[PDB]
Amino acid sequence: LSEINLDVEGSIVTVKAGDLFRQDGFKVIAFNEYFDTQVDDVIISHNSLNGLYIDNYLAGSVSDLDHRISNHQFEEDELLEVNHKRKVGKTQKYSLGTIFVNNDYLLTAFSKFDDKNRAFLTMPDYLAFLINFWDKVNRIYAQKSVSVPIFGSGITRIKEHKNISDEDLLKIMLWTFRISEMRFKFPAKLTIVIHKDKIDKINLLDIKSARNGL
Amino acid sequence: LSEINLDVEGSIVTVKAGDLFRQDGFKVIAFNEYFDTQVDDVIISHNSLNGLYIDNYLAGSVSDLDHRISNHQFEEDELLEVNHKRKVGKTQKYSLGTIFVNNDYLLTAFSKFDDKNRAFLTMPDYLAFLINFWDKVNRIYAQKSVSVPIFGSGITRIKEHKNISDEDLLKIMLWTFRISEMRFKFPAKLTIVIHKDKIDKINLLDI
Numbered sequence: 001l002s003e004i005n006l007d008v009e010g011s012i013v014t015v016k017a018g019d020l021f022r023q024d025g026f027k028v029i030a031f032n033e034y035f036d037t038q039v040d041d042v043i044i045s046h047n048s049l050n051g052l053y054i055d056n057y058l059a060g061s062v063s064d065l066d067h068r069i070s071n072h073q074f075e076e077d078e079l080l081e082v083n084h085k086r087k088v089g090k091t092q093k094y095s096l097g098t099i100f101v102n103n104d105y106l107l108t109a110f111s112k113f114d115d116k117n118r119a120f121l122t123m124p125d126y127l128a129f130l131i132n133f134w135d136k137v138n139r140i141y142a143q144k145s146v147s148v149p150i151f152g153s154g155i156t157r158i159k160e161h162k163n164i165s166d167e168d169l170l171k172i173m174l175w176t177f178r179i180s181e182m183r184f185k186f187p188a189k190l191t192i193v194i195h196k197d198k199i200d201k202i203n204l205l206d207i208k209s210a211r212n213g214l
Numbered sequence: 215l216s217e218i219n220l221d222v223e224g225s226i227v228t229v230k231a232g233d234l235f236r237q238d239g240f241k242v243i244a245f246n247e248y249f250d251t252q253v254d255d256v257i258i259s260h261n262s263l264n265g266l267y268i269d270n271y272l273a274g275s276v277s278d279l280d281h282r283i284s285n286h287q288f289e290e291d292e293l294l295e296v297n298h299k300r301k302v303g304k305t306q307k308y309s310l311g312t313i314f315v316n317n318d319y320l321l322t323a324f325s326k327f328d329d330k331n332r333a334f335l336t337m338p339d340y341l342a343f344l345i346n347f348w349d350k351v352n353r354i355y356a357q358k359s360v361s362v363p364i365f366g367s368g369i370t371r372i373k374e375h376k377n378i379s380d381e382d383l384l385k386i387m388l389w390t391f392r393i394s395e396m397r398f399k400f401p402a403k404l405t406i407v408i409h410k411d412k413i414d415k416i417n418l419l420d421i
Contacts, residue, residue, distance in 0.1 A: 127341040214388070
């Protein structure tokens, strides 16, 4: 079984094996809190989806995107404090769930970076990113297709849940999307794209319950 | 029906109709971020579970409790800022999920208060409180009985979710608890208590 459609409180949500970059419509790439763009296996890694987007899929130079983000008008709440101590990498912190749209890609600030440029989140941070993100897309991209990976199944560490399964992350994503879409009467059309090789690990049948919040 | 036991990650979580104050073991009362104690229908309502506890069940004086909390030594993360502008009530703010023990009662910092002193939470606040709260009780009160109400099903307003239902709050509580106990060999023994007048609108059968 490689695809499932579920009714989540009135909206059809699709979970399917595939390649995110082959999806038509809006595609979500998970960046870090600084919206770093330097793929040198030091800040951003070449195996991440964040570095893979920049390496082979970004339109234009990395230097052009940096200036588009630097000269972008983020809400007063989406802008955080500036880490002047950051040695290697950008300095402006952004609040999780922040979205910078770039052609048909939604670059979202997902993971945090510690003093040792390690990608991490706490479970409260993870659930808070999801709720904020789901709010922004259901509000801004109502009725538009949005395709997302399994947030946090890559190198991002969820503190104290290092062994969390992609199947648990997937259920959480559906629980938090339900909480969000239930306040919107025309939410986004959500597709969760699972890497074709990882789909054999996940039992899509263990997830259907999350469409009702359990 | 009125009671169900759920096999959550191997642990049993009881959901029952009844009166929280009649439970054996630990009973959780939700306070605000300042741990205020002035039941006066402006900063703490006399109808809230917070008010009923202080008015009808607090063993000791409110002053004994305020001072005991003041002189209590929380963690460094649990102690946040100090609203000096605070026109009324305590000024020390605590991080949601902080617990102060008071006999067989766990007084936990749950709701936030605004300028008008409205009890409120963002949905990310609510989920963060639960994860931070569950982790504390699963670590400190492992194998001990902890009874709780449905957090958020009272005067507290979850922003953008003014009309969230008690059944939906119960569902959030149950899967945020699962995430928590996941990382504990011996979690706490959780009993979620619903008020008899609300088990009609909630179908524990569904769940």
